[PDB]
Design a protein around this ligand. Sequence first.
Ligand code: COO
Ligand code: ZN
Lengths: 75, 233, 29, 265
Amino acid sequence: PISATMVGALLGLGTQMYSNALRKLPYMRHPWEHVVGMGLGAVFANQLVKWDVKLKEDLDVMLAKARAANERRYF
Amino acid sequence: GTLGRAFYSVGFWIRETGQALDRLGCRLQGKNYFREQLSRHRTLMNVFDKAPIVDKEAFVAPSASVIGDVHIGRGSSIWYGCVLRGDVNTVSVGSGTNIQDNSLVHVAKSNLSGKVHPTIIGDNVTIGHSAVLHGCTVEDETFIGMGATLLDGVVVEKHGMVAAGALVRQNTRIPSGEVWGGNPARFLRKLTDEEIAFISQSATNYSNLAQAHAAENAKPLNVIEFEKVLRKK
Amino acid sequence: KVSEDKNRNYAVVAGVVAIVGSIGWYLKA
Amino acid sequence: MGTLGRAIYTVGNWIRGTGQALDRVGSLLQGSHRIEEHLSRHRTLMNVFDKSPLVDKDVFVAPSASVIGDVQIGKGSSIWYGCVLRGDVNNISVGSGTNIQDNTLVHVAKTNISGKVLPTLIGDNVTVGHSAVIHGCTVEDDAFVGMGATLLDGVVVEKHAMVAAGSLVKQNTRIPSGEVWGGNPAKFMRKLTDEEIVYISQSAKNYINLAQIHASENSKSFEQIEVERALRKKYARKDEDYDSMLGITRETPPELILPDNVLPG
Ligand SMILES: C/C=C/C(=O)SCCNC(=O)CCNC(=O)[C@H](O)C(C)(C)COP(=O)(O)OP(=O)(O)OC[C@H]1O[C@@H](n2cnc3c(N)ncnc32)[C@H](O)[C@@H]1OP(=O)(O)O
Ligand SMILES: [Zn+2]
């Protein structure tokens, strides 16, 4: 389907083309950089997904402690 | 077509990558010869699949520019500094025809002013030095004066003569055996038989002269000049 | 036959070391 | 140097081979349609019919110019970019201190239609403007041919005469001294003021000076081109504030300084 890897690869390729266009260069100037950008974007998207999962776990632990501290009031 | 154009584009990506790799390899060996500014002029230049088709017995000066779909026939000659650009349409040159030094034979760059007319040059035609032909037909055995300009739509009927420095306005027809000249081009007089003989004999003399120049240009490049340029201080 | 610029050669070695080391870093983590 | 030097050289060989193979594959994918750029076959000076051009020591010939056949060019003259001097069927003579400007054609005739066929003679201190066309005619000393002008066979431009820019001078027409002719066909326009005579001389001398800097640039070798490219980049901008903090004064290298005779002042 629409995995993180594909979204990241597309974003990285688009980032290399956008950069070339902002510099008035042909869209495909230095194609090996387009390959590098695809790889880096894929890696970044997958790592962002993993980091988001980890963040949620940490937040749940923090929210559990906050609710325990708040429930201590009614003791 | 479109698929050929896509393969041509993707091909350029592979070539760009390979040439970059070669430059890397030369850099690791401490060579900078790829930084040398050498002329990228091509005597015959293609624009995708529109390439020039030149007969083997046609002389083309190395400094001349033949771009796109250009047809040069047998015994014809493209002299020093000439430019022929048929890209939006075609440019065809007949046999035994001389296009003299610094002449420009091209078609309209854009179709904004209507459909782009091709340029047709007939047989045994003489085109004088620094003449401008722009989307016009020039029939067989005609004489285009040097420094003259022919605009799109013009027809120079067989045995027509355009005087040196003339400006033949758009869509003008030059009848046979007439000499037209001036800006704007206007009928001057009729062509005499001696001048017809001169037309044909001049086209023949230039075919022999083209042959002589082709042999001196095809002589192998001299190594001594190369070593002198290389060892300068 | 031989590349003379020593500093260039050391830089090349450093770049290769960085690439192989990054690959090993991924491979062992 | 050393073993590491040899290993890196060998690896560079492998990378070069891979790069050229990839270039070949990319050419195949293009359908072989692109015509390959080749070494330059244009010859600045060429022989034809066992005739060699006789060119003085101090003559600027632009590498893109074409000097062919029986051409004589005298001291201090200059042949500019795109000029074609084809002396294949007759002689072309250029005097001293004469400039033939960009994209100009000079040709001769073997036998004109009627009358005695003559070679092409261009005298001393003559200015010929851009994209002029000189065909089998005579230009005498201290004359001026305007840019885009056309002299046909048998034309004589006399001393201190001018042909206006863009003119068409018909066959056998004689421009006498002191006059300027112009138009299509060329005809008398007015007399030449003395200030214009001084202008003609100044034009010839200015072009003598311009030819020097152009000739010096066009004859530099690859190494000197690289040296001057680096120097030009080095001195393109400045930080005189930081220089004054360091207490140094960066000076423009002499190879980037033009002589004063070509400067506008
Ligand atoms: C040191 C560096 C040196 C160089 O590189 S300079 C060489 C390149 N520069 C040139 O070739 C341009 C030199 N200057 C000229 O040629 C110039 O024109 C010229 C030298 C005829 C003279 O041009 P003027 O500015 O002096 O024009 P005039 O008023 O004297 O002439 C009158 C008339 O001539 C006509 N006019 C004038 N000049 C020309 C022409 N040429 N053609 C046609 N028609 C013209 C025009 O009709 C004018 O009005 P009308 O009678 O109503 O027609
Ligand atoms: Zn000629």
